[PDB]
Amino acid sequence: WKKQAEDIKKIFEFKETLGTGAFSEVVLAEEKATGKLFAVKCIPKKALKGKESSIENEIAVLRKIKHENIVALEDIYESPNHLYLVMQLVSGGELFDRIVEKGFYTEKDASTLIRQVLDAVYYLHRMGIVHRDLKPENLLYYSQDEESKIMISDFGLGYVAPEVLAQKPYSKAVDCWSIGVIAYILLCGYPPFYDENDSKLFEQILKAEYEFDSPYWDDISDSAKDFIRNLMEKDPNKRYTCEQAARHPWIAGDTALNKNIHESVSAQIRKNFA
Numbered sequence: 001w002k003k004q005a006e007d008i009k010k011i012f013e014f015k016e017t018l019g020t021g022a023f024s025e026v027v028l029a030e031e032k033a034t035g036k037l038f039a040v041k042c043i044p045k046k047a048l049k050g051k052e053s054s055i056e057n058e059i060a061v062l063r064k065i066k067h068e069n070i071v072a073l074e075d076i077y078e079s080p081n082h083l084y085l086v087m088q089l090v091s092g093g094e095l096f097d098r099i100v101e102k103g104f105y106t107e108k109d110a111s112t113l114i115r116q117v118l119d120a121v122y123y124l125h126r127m128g129i130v131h132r133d134l135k136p137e138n139l140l141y142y143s144q145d146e147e148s149k150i151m152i153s154d155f156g157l158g159y160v161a162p163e164v165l166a167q168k169p170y171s172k173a174v175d176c177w178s179i180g181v182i183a184y185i186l187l188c189g190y191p192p193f194y195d196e197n198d199s200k201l202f203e204q205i206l207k208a209e210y211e212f213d214s215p216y217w218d219d220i221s222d223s224a225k226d227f228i229r230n231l232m233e234k235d236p237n238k239r240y241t242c243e244q245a246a247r248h249p250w251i252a253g254d255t256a257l258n259k260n261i262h263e264s265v266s267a268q269i270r271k272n273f274a
């Protein structure tokens with residue numbers, strides 16, 4: 001299943017870095033043989049020492065599975081000192097850019113986005129993967145047009161749950177908290193927790209102290225607010241799972257409103273982010 005290369009440069013031309021992690025880099029790559037573009041995750045094998053077999057066994061499982069809302073793992077190359085995970089290039093645009101660029105945006109649009117993220121994350125959880133880094137930056141559109149699906153663009157083999165901040169044991173439920181935070185930002189354009197003081201911010205997240213403040217939340221449905229409260233729940237035992245959230249009427253039913261909330265959401269995205 002793993003392709004072997006003496007030098008990955010025999011296969012790919014590397015262009016700009018898309019993301020930099022701890023001993024992982026995602027780079028735009030062109031396959032020299034075809035001209036096709038990919039996002040290639042470059043990993044030094046020395047960084048995997050003691051878990052190489054385990055990580056490869058997991059990649060071997062995921063290479064065979066495509067989820068509509070997750071970057072496909074297209075190929076794996078092994079060089080003498082690196083692994084290269086050849087991923088689908090998700091080229092349709094960034095999440096916040098799209099919302100700002102739209103002239104018209106409703107709760108139904110936000111619900112549609114969250115439904116896709118719930119589907120993707122439910123699947124990762126079934127496979128034993130806790131994403132741990134769900135945030136707008138990891139969500140990209142497949143295509144530039146208005147019907148494009150959203151995709152989780154990257155995953156590991158302010159948005160962090162209170163139990164993680166409390167250095168307590170944590171589970172897949174941390175992802176459900178993060179999805180609630182994303183839903184919050186999608187309906188008002190600003191984060192639910194922020195303070196210039198990190199200590200105050202830490203305490204607000206630990207206590208799950210947030211509000212649906214006026215005027216930004218006045219024309220948002222009770223159903224949306226209930227949906228968010230069930231995910232942004234301090235107690236991971238009480239917190240909705242992805243499965244429970246997918247059954248809530250705001251996702252599965254017809255309670256998401258049809259009001260154009262673009263003006264306020266786009267103004268707040270512009271004002272609250274760089």
Ligand SMILES: CC(C)(C#N)c1cc(Nc2nc(N3CCC[C@H](N)C3)ncc2C(N)=O)cc(C(C)(C)C#N)c1
Nearest residue numbers: 018019026028039071087088089090091137138153154
């Ligand atoms: C080259 C371009 C214009 C296209 N086509 C483009 C493609 C992507 N694509 C990906 N970006 C990432 N990362 C960046 C986001 C956070 C994540 N942790 C790592 N990882 C995987 C993919 C993928 N699967 O395509 C990203 C950007 C930029 C950098 C502008 C953004 N955002 C630009």
